[PDB]
Amino acid sequence: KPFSCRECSKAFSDPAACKAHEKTHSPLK
Ligand SMILES: [Zn+2]
């Protein structure tokens, strides 16, 4: 996993999965 959510320790292997996960820790709306 080159992409790991530091906040909630949820790592991903998809750069976009982590990107969508980024947008859920930082709400777009
Ligand atoms: Zn997270």
Q: How many CB atoms lie within 10 A of CB 19?
A: 11
Residue 5 CA to ligand 1 center (angstroms) comes to: 5
Residue 6 CA to ligand 1 center (angstroms) comes to: 7
Residue 29 CA to ligand 1 center (angstroms) comes to: 17
For residue 5, what are the contacts with CB-CB under 8 A and spacing of at least 6?
11, 12, 18, 21, 22, 25
Q: Are the C-beta atoms of 12 and 21 separated by less than 8 Å?
A: yes
| Determination approach | NMR
Residue 9 CA to ligand 1 center (angstroms) comes to: 6
Q: Which helix (H) or strand (E) holds 12?
A: strand 11-12
